[PDB]
Amino acid sequence: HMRVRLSKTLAGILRHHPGRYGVRLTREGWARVSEVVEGLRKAGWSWVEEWHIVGVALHDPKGRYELRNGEIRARYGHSIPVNVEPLPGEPPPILYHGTTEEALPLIMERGIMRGRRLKVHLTSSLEDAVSTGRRHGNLVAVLLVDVECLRRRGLKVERMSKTVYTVDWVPPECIAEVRRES
Numbered sequence: 001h002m003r004v005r006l007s008k009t010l011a012g013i014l015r016h017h018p019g020r021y022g023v024r025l026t027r028e029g030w031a032r033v034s035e036v037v038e039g040l041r042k043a044g045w046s047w048v049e050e051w052h053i054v055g056v057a058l059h060d061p062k063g064r065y066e067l068r069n070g071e072i073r074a075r076y077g078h079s080i081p082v083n084v085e086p087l088p089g090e091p092p093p094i095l096y097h098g099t100t101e102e103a104l105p106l107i108m109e110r111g112i113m114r115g116r117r118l119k120v121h122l123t124s125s126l127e128d129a130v131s132t133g134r135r136h137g138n139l140v141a142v143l144l145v146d147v148e149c150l151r152r153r154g155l156k157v158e159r160m161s162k163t164v165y166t167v168d169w170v171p172p173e174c175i176a177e178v179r180r181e182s
């Protein structure tokens with residue numbers, strides 16, 4: 001079966017619309033795998049069981065998901081209120097945010113903003129930043145973000161996966177450089 005298709009649906013459940021699949025999340029974002037399974041099956045994923053949902057989490061190349069006995073959550077990316085504790089580690093001095101060239105003027109005015117999500121998402125992987133920008137358009141720009149510039153003004157830069165870090169907002173003055181990718 002197509003793991004990527006099931007993972008995209010699962011990310012939607014755990015980040016955006018759990019109730020549409022019969023799921024209630026705890027305030028830390030955790031879903032009961034059994035509830036996720038039943039909702040997917042009712043939506044036509046007629047073969048899915050716990051084994052497959054757990055497998056999506058374990059095989060995810062990015063570490064999007066976290067498991068503990070009976071439960072699963074998304075580590076980041078949510079548009080519904082959750083509190084996820086950070087993974088250990090310090091952020092590197094530069095992080096990336098992929099976007100579109102068309103967004104640059106308003107980013108240079110208002111900073112990088114969270115939009116519909118709880119946080120602005122940054123990555124230590126330039127390649128991942130490019131692929132994220134490409135979801136929004138073909139003319140991609142990657143912002144290099146000065147992490148100490150965020151931290152010294154009191155903005156926590158929290159590690160959510162091996163490569164993804166969240167921050168409430170990126171002030172325009174903390175954008176060190178723009179790299180073009182067409």
Ligand SMILES: Nc1ncnc2c1ncn2[C@@H]1O[C@H](COP(=O)(O)OP(=O)(O)OC[C@H]2O[C@@H](O)[C@H](OP(=O)(O)O)[C@@H]2O)[C@@H](O)[C@H]1O
Nearest residue numbers: 064077098099103106107110111112113115117121132136
């Ligand atoms: N001041 C502004 N004026 C105009 N535009 C602005 C401004 N600030 C930002 N923007 C743009 O708005 C779009 C928001 O879209 P958005 O919420 O989908 O954010 P975005 O960062 O793309 O997605 C998060 C997922 O991307 C990976 O970090 C990870 O995904 P993975 O789990 O696959 O690793 C994560 O979940 C973005 O274009 C952003 O630049």
Ligand SMILES: [Cl-]
Nearest residue numbers: 067068069070
């Ligand atoms: Cl456990």
Ligand SMILES: [Cl-]
Nearest residue numbers: 077078118119
């Ligand atoms: Cl978020």
Ligand SMILES: [K+]
Nearest residue numbers: 024031032035
């Ligand atoms: K649940």
Ligand SMILES: [K+]
Nearest residue numbers: 064074075076
């Ligand atoms: K995630």
Ligand SMILES: [K+]
Nearest residue numbers: 114119120121
């Ligand atoms: K973001």
Ligand SMILES: [K+]
Nearest residue numbers: 156158166167
């Ligand atoms: K954060």
